[PDB]
Design a binder for this molecule. Structure first.
Ligand code: CA
Length: 274
């Protein structure tokens, strides 16, 4: 039996898929802790590792495999279902088994993706400080027509302070916040002026290391929902530029409240791709 995470119906991804658009021919790269490529519910086409001692196709953490599942868990009779199950999946390992990585390793990942013709880049990661090299790698991938999506951060609320991390904070990157199955913002979801859109990030069920599925909380689970949506929109309107895809996302977002806590609102892929 194949389970369908509340995340996909909530963003209306099920309606677009029903139309026949599943992200086919779109190249999405997940910049994470890698992916357990042997997982029966995932199809990794390629990737690269910029972390010493670890190949791109193994996930000794779980984070990468789970984020990858949210974007493209195969549409079969088992496991879960991704937002864009027909996407071309690339695993770019920029974080080690402990979920950490260096600026250089990440910059190399961003660069590799841009150079290898990735259409969408997912970065479920963030740090308190940015780097000018990271800022250029991102501004360029975006300028080169690549859709860059990043988790906004799990620093939650803290008085009236900006808790958005990098690279989510850079203009060429879409900062994704998290909400639960009731569309209520999750208390851990970072807040700040740079917040752009919200997506299911609380209790999301997805693929997990050694042929299984688990549930996790975090803006990291939210980001892959927006990356899968970008891929859906593109599988329908191949001619759109990254800038246009991104605008359709924030323009057709279901208003939830102040932009500081929700951005433009919960994404609606049916409205964005129409
Ligand atoms: Ca499946």
């Amino acid at each position: 039996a194949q389970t369908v995470p509340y995340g996909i119906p909530l963003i209306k991804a099920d309606k677009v898929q029903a139309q026949g658009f599943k992200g086919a021919n779109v190249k999405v790269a997940v910049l994470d802790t890698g992916i357990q490529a042997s997982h029966p519910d995932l199809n990794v086409v390629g990737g690269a590792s910029f972390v010493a001692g670890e190949a791109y196709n193994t996930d000794g953490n779980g984070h990468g495999t789970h984020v990858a599942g949210t974007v493209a868990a195969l549409d079969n009779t088992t496991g879960v279902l991704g937002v864009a199950p027909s996407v071309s999946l690339y695993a770019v390992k920029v974080l080690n088994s402990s979920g950490s990585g260096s600026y250089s390793g990440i910059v190399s990942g961003i660069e590799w993706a841009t150079t290898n013709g990735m259409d969408v880049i997912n970065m479920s990661l963030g740090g308190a400080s940015g780097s000018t090299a990271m800022k250029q790698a991102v501004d360029n991938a975006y300028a080169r027509g690549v859709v860059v999506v990043a988790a906004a951060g799990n620093s939650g609320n803290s008085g009236s302070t900006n808790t958005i991390g990098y690279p989510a904070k850079y203009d060429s990157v879409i900062a994704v916040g998290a909400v639960d199955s009731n569309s209520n913002r999750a208390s851990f979801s970072s807040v700040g002026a740079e917040l752009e859109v919200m997506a299911p990030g609380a209790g999301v069920y997805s693929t997990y290391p050694t042929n299984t599925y688990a549930t996790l909380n975090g803006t990291s689970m939210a980001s892959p929902h927006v990356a899968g949506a970008a891929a859906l929109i593109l599988s329908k309107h191949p001619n759109l530029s990254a800038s246009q895809v991104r605008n359709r996302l924030s323009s057709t977002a279901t208003y939830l409240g102040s932009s500081f806590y929700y951005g433009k609102g919960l994404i609606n892929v049916e409205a964005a791709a129409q």
